[PDB]
Paper text:
The most potent, C2.2, fully blocked currents at 200 µM, and dose-response data were fit with an IC50 of 6.6 µM, more than 10-fold higher than the IC50 of C11. Comparing DrOTOP1_C2.2 with DrOTOP1_apo, we searched the C-domain pocket for non-protein density, but could not identify any, suggesting that C2.2 was not bound there either. Upon closer comparison, we found two regions on the intracellular half of the intrasubunit interface that contained more convincing cryo-EM density that could correspond to C2.2 molecules, compared to the C-domain pocket. We refer to these as the “outer site”, facing the lipid bilayer (right), and the “central site”, facing the central cavity (right). Notably, both sites are exposed to bulk lipid – the outer site to nanodisc lipids and the central site to the lipid-filled central cavity of DrOTOP1 – and were previously identified as cholesterol binding sites in DrOTOP1_apo (Fleft). Based on the shape of the density and accompanying local conformational changes, we conclude that C2.2 binds to both sites and replaces the endogenous cholesterols. Thus, the conformational changes resulting from two copies of C2.2 binding simultaneously are highly localized to the binding sites and nearby TMs. As per the binding pose that best fits our cryo-EM density, C2.2 forms the following interactions in the outer site: hydrophobic packing against many non-polar residues W126, G130, M133, L134, F271, F570, and M573, and π-stacking with W532. Considering other inhibitors discovered from the second round of screening, many contain functional groups like the carbonyl groups of Group 1 molecules and the heterocyclic nitrogen atoms of Group 2 molecules, that can potentially form similar H-bonds with E267 as C2.2 and C2.36, assuming the binding modes are similar. In the central site, C2.2 binds with the following interactions: hydrophobic packing with residues V201, F271, A274, V278, and A388, π-stacking with F277, and H-bonding with E384.
Author numbering:
A (entry chain A), B (entry chain B): 47 to 110, 124 to 153, 158 to 184, 187 to 216, 252 to 285, 305 to 327, 334 to 373, 376 to 443, ...
Amino acid sequence: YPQKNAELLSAQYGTNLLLLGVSVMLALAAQSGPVKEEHLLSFITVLMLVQLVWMLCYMIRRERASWIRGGLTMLALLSLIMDAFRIGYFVGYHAALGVYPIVHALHTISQVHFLWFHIKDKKYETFERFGVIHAVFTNLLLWCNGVMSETSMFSTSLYYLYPFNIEYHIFVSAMLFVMWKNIGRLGPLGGLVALASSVSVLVVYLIHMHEAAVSMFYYYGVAMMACMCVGSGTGLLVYRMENRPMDTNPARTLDTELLLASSLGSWLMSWCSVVASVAEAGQKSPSFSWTSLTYSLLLVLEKCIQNLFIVESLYRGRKRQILKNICMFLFMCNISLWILPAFGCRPQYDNPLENETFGTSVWTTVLNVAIPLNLFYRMHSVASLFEVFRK
Amino acid sequence: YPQKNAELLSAQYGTNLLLLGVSVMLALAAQSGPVKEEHLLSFITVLMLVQLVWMLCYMIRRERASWIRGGLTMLALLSLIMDAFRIGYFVGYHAALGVYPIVHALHTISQVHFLWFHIKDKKYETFERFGVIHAVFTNLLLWCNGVMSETSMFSTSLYYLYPFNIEYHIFVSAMLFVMWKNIGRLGPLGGLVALASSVSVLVVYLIHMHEAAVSMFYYYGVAMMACMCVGSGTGLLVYRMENRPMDTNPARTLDTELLLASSLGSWLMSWCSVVASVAEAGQKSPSFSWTSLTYSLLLVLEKCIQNLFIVESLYRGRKRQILKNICMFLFMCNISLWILPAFGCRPQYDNPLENETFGTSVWTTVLNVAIPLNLFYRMHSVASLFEVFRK
Ligand SMILES: CC(C)CCC[C@@H](C)[C@H]1CC[C@H]2[C@@H]3CC=C4C[C@@H](OC(=O)CCC(=O)O)CC[C@]4(C)[C@H]3CC[C@]12C
Ligand SMILES: CC(C)CCC[C@@H](C)[C@H]1CC[C@H]2[C@@H]3CC=C4C[C@@H](OC(=O)CCC(=O)O)CC[C@]4(C)[C@H]3CC[C@]12C
Ligand SMILES: CC(C)CCC[C@@H](C)[C@H]1CC[C@H]2[C@@H]3CC=C4C[C@@H](OC(=O)CCC(=O)O)CC[C@]4(C)[C@H]3CC[C@]12C
Ligand SMILES: CC(C)CCC[C@@H](C)[C@H]1CC[C@H]2[C@@H]3CC=C4C[C@@H](OC(=O)CCC(=O)O)CC[C@]4(C)[C@H]3CC[C@]12C
Ligand SMILES: CC(C)CCC[C@@H](C)[C@H]1CC[C@H]2[C@@H]3CC=C4C[C@@H](O)CC[C@]4(C)[C@H]3CC[C@]12C
Ligand SMILES: CC(C)CCC[C@@H](C)[C@H]1CC[C@H]2[C@@H]3CC=C4C[C@@H](O)CC[C@]4(C)[C@H]3CC[C@]12C
Ligand SMILES: CC(C)CCC[C@@H](C)[C@H]1CC[C@H]2[C@@H]3CC=C4C[C@@H](O)CC[C@]4(C)[C@H]3CC[C@]12C
Ligand SMILES: CC(C)CCC[C@@H](C)[C@H]1CC[C@H]2[C@@H]3CC=C4C[C@@H](O)CC[C@]4(C)[C@H]3CC[C@]12C
Ligand SMILES: CC(C)CCC[C@@H](C)[C@H]1CC[C@H]2[C@@H]3CC=C4C[C@@H](O)CC[C@]4(C)[C@H]3CC[C@]12C
Ligand SMILES: CC(C)CCC[C@@H](C)[C@H]1CC[C@H]2[C@@H]3CC=C4C[C@@H](O)CC[C@]4(C)[C@H]3CC[C@]12C
Ligand SMILES: C=C(C)COc1ccccc1NC(=O)c1[nH]cnc1C
Ligand SMILES: C=C(C)COc1ccccc1NC(=O)c1[nH]cnc1C
Ligand SMILES: C=C(C)COc1ccccc1NC(=O)c1[nH]cnc1C
Ligand SMILES: C=C(C)COc1ccccc1NC(=O)c1[nH]cnc1C
């Protein structure tokens, strides 16, 4: 069977799968069509079952860097803890919402065991193509279901565990698509101050009275992003002074594309905040404050300059010390900016300004898309910054 | 200035431009936010003005195949006729809706004159990068505005001219993105029967009483897509019999990717129709008919087999006659299937089944995304089929 024929048919089957899923979600979004949620959950359950059957055959036939695998395993284990909580709820409160968690837990176990023990190889190329493309778009549809459906201890625990589930499904979908295309072919002192201020702000918030806490969160974010922009810009300036060939790797290219694709969520969130801020300021209202406009423009500019710095640092006496201290300072700053959203410091959802401009559903869906991508971006940047720091 | 630095900053600026536009459209979609339509029209007017300023500088500094250019010129001239109609309306019925049509007409004139007389070149690479990426995302935002806002003779003419405007903006955006990435680097008898039946069905419909006309449209489409699937499949079978190396071009790759990206609209439309059909059939209702389910599954399968055939025909005595007659038959069938939507035979919008399942706004937006892409697909396939027919 010709290779191109399969590279094309696999892609068409996968795209049709995604568009059928999107069609069912559109029928659901209406809320007056016959299509109800349990039909979507059943569709995705069938799409997870087929993938389990495929991976089972694959493991039957197969018998006859670490940063991305450890990240996938830890996000899959958080997703599994969430599923265990959902199975416990179902058992206590007893149809499709009981059978979904169990096929989801089996799907995550099989998918971790597959990603870990996968071997690149040759006779079975159509099988691998159609199965990886099924896995990619089943994980995308699961990401979409999570983003659309999240709009005693069973309510307090999901709040903390949903971002990692959504981030797990988009991440594994990205890695599986990357695997499809290739078938058949002083700085420490500042860093510590950053970590301490982060953990403090988080404890303060989660103990909380509350408006002062969110104000403290925004002031922290603004100061942190300003000093980060300064660090990355000084790194770029030291690069521009020391004119070097700036030439030469698939891994480096994947890293660049992931680093720039993980920022779409935060950029959308920042531009929604800026649009709401200027719209409300047009009314000549007392509500307009410059700590949300500044914090959003600094979000945009900080992740732009950081992306530029990391990419220029990967494709490339006092300059060596200056780059070491800049890389360590940004390492610790990105850790400090990852700990806040991860540990429940997500105060954006209750913002009354973007809830009144965009509506509660649109704002919470934008945040559900953005905050998981933000966590991924921050920790991918931490990995890239350590890799730069070692060179 | 390093090249990568610019390839990256251009992409980040363009992505931020797109996300700011999407944020303004989200603020508009709510319908209760301060953001009203004239603010979007003004944003896009600024984004067209900046592009005109860029192209003016570019033409100042520059002094010191044909299928895709003729297609762009003819779709730009239809868009210009639409803009002339809008300027005439404004003049008769007299703020932002008057200044938008005129900057849009200037933008289309400048953009045609730019695409025609563009030269690949070297000192000014950052300028070209930032300007082509501005053009790509300004054309995308114009596509989005058209798709979202279309949801005496000034009402009858836009109905016929809007699909070509939307198709023009997505097409020119695609070509400009393709231009960005490369900076600094018997069958005739059946075919005639097809053409005659098309023109007949169209005249019948536009003269119309009406339910029989839409039924005739669906029966025509079903028979035509069945015989097309048979033709493409027989071509693929003749290929599979004659085992050939099936090896070896940038143009061929662009053609394949455009041919498969133009089908997303039709596939989404077909899967929405299938989801609505099975949802209504679940109620055990008398409305369920198999001429909409069949016509949708045939849409999906026909464009899959056609894509496969064209791609296998580009990357590659009675077999030669059989392939000539198959290519000519599909040439004329795709012309017959392009003439119906182009000349006003668009009966999908008034479908009560997908209007009740998905809602009128979601269905009309899905059709506004799909029917322009469908026209592009059909005529791109006609071009590819003639190119195959000559070899
Ligand atoms: C591989 C690439 C495309 C990245 C993955 C992203 C997609 C999976 C996204 C892109 C656009 C998304 C769609 C865009 C908007 C909608 C409409 C939304 O419903 C409404 O807006 C309801 C409208 C109403 O209020 O009536 C439901 C989700 C859906 C289908 C989204 C589902 C997920 C999609 C396909
Ligand atoms: C994952 C990477 C590769 C791409 C991310 C691109 C995002 C900018 C896209 C993808 C999904 C999109 C969302 C898909 C669906 C929705 C829900 C939609 O609102 C509803 O569905 C509510 C309807 C109602 O309340 O009646 C508003 C737009 C939004 C947030 C979309 C905004 C644009 C998003 C976030
Ligand atoms: C370069 C690639 C991404 C192709 C180009 C496609 C994008 C320009 C599309 C993909 C998803 C689209 C968005 C997905 C859904 C929405 C939500 C829609 O508003 C609602 O659904 C309102 C929700 C409600 O009812 O409350 C307005 C358009 C918007 C922002 C879309 C704008 C155009 C987007 C960004
Ligand atoms: C152009 C190529 C490269 C990609 C095409 C992908 C499409 C499948 C995406 C892009 C734009 C998306 C649309 C963007 C916005 C909308 C409008 C949205 O409905 C509303 O905004 C209505 C809100 C209301 O009525 O309150 C429903 C989903 C839909 C049609 C989205 C469905 C998925 C679409 C067609
Ligand atoms: C080892 C790696 C993967 C980290 C694991 C973190 C685990 C231990 C975390 C993640 C989410 C957490 C839960 C989130 C919230 C609640 C609800 C509260 O009323 C009791 C504690 C409980 C139930 C937490 C227990 C600890 C928990 C399960
Ligand atoms: C609604 C969302 C999806 C809008 C954004 C879609 C498009 C414009 C985005 C999505 C991801 C983006 C890519 C992500 C990363 C890279 C690698 C970088 O070295 C050059 C730019 C490039 C190649 C980007 C180009 C623009 C891009 C393709
Ligand atoms: C691997 C990483 C990402 C795991 C992160 C797990 C985080 C979210 C977990 C670890 C310990 C957890 C806390 C443990 C106990 C409590 C006390 C309880 O009364 C409220 C929830 C709260 C405050 C939990 C919140 C979530 C928490 C901070
Ligand atoms: C030369 C190429 C680009 C094709 C051009 C086609 C032109 C001539 C077509 C496209 C749309 C057409 C218009 C669409 C509908 C109407 C409204 C009707 O009440 C009078 C005729 C009028 C005003 C048409 C005149 C002819 C028209 C302008
Ligand atoms: C809502 C819409 C955008 C969903 C679809 C998005 C993704 C999955 C689609 C959009 C366009 C698609 C590409 C279009 C064309 C080609 C060239 C072909 O030789 C291999 C598949 C490939 C490379 C497709 C892969 C899947 C793809 C990237
Ligand atoms: C280059 C190609 C795509 C141009 C296509 C232009 C098409 C849409 C134009 C050409 C001539 C036009 C027709 C000319 C005259 C009339 C009679 C009028 O009472 C109703 C509109 C109607 C029936 C027009 C409909 C649109 C039309 C068919
Ligand atoms: C030991 C570890 C790296 C795990 O730390 C985590 C804990 C929870 C969630 C995610 C991650 N890690 C990541 O996401 C990561 N690391 C590098 N690249 C990515 C994408
Ligand atoms: C991190 C993300 C937002 C994931 O985005 C995706 C979503 C669905 C499918 C694929 C991808 N990512 C990619 O394909 C990619 N990223 C880098 N290099 C490639 C080839
Ligand atoms: C002489 C012509 C080709 C023009 O015919 C048209 C008329 C109206 C609208 C579009 C087109 N042509 C196309 O769209 C085309 N041709 C090849 N590739 C594409 C994308
Ligand atoms: C025909 C379309 C649906 C256009 O889709 C787009 C929309 C916005 C920007 C770019 C593209 N198309 C591409 O980038 C493309 N198509 C083929 N090869 C490339 C490199």
